């Protein structure tokens, strides 16, 4: 559903042909294309903001789409999945191109550098991996497994140090300056990192 905030009204609504449950969404900076992802189809639906028609469905994921983001400047679309891969979509233009990049494990969250030249992704291994969009090559990585703090639940019958319930980050985001990433997960910890140096700035309870 698309909402006008000056007048506070739902001016348009989009939906799939067979009522697909959506989990993530991304919007063109031009405000003319909207894409959403689902955990049941492995396809990224595309809608036109102006018309409300399904432009097309992007296919190519061998797993469920976990996250989406349109580059603010270049307008590339980067999508990740539990597929252990990341795909960059150049939907705009006469020809459509897709550049897949493999990742060590399932991708839970993705962030996009405001410049639009790099993309960061959090994996189940507890790794925040930064790639170069233009070159499609990894430029940096950060370990997260040890920094995260997870408390043994009252119903747990196994120790917290042995626990693997949550030592990954389910959400990440850049700083607008572009030198830091804020991350969180199903845990008791929020960790702020410094991308170029790959170190922990500070942790929050």
């Amino acid at each position: 559903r698309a909402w006008d905030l000056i007048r506070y009204r739902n001016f348009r609504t989009f939906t799939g042909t067979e009522r697909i449950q959506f989990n993530c969404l991304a919007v063109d900076p031009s405000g003319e294309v909207v894409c959403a992802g689902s955990l049941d189809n492995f396809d990224i639906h595309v809608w036109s903001v102006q018309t409300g028609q399904l432009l097309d469905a992007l296919s190519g994921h061998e797993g469920p789409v976990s996250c989406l983001s349109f580059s603010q400047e270049n307008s590339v679309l980067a999508s990740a999945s539990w597929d252990k891969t990341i795909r960059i979509w150049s939907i705009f233009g006469r020809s459509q191109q897709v550049e897949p990049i493999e990742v060590y494990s399932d991708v839970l969250a993705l962030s996009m550098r405001p410049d639009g030249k790099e993309v960061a992704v959090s994996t189940l291994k507890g790794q925040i991996s930064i790639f170069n969009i233009e070159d499609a090559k990894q430029v940096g990585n950060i370990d997260c497994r040890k920094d995260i703090i997870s408390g043994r639940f009252n119903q747990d019958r196994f120790t917290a140090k042995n626990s693997e319930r949550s030592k990954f980050f389910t959400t990440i985001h850049y700083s607008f300056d572009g030198m830091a990433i804020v991350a969180g997960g199903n845990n008791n910890s929020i960790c702020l990192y410094d991308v170029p140096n790959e170190v922990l700035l500070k942790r929050f309870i």
Binding site: L124, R157, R165
Partner: protein, 142 residues
Amino acid sequence: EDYHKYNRICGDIRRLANKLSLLPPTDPFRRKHEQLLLDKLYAMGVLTTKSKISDLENKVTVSAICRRRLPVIMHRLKMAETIQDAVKFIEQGHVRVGPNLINDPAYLVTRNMEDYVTWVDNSKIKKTLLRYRNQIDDFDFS
């Protein structure tokens, strides 16, 4: 084995359908909640295939709800010898349903999440499996 709760769910489904069947067939409200009901029952998997309200009256059973319990699924999926062994693995925290770890044997898998039930990455027992095939990778931590 007690199934009072599951019986309460199945009975409530029947009561909802009966109350629906009372409402006029032409009422648009009746039709959608029927279809919404059939949808969710399909979504959970207790309805293996899309069905009609008449089938939803009788096809729903305690066994179908018991069928979707996480330890039962592993038993069909051949992870554990028996339901008791499956419960112990769920209990010990070696089982993972998609992005999250489930330690509750009482949890049931929805139809979509069935394909992603798998053991946690660093479970010692995975190391046994890949050791048997001799396909253990220490780089992958499993």
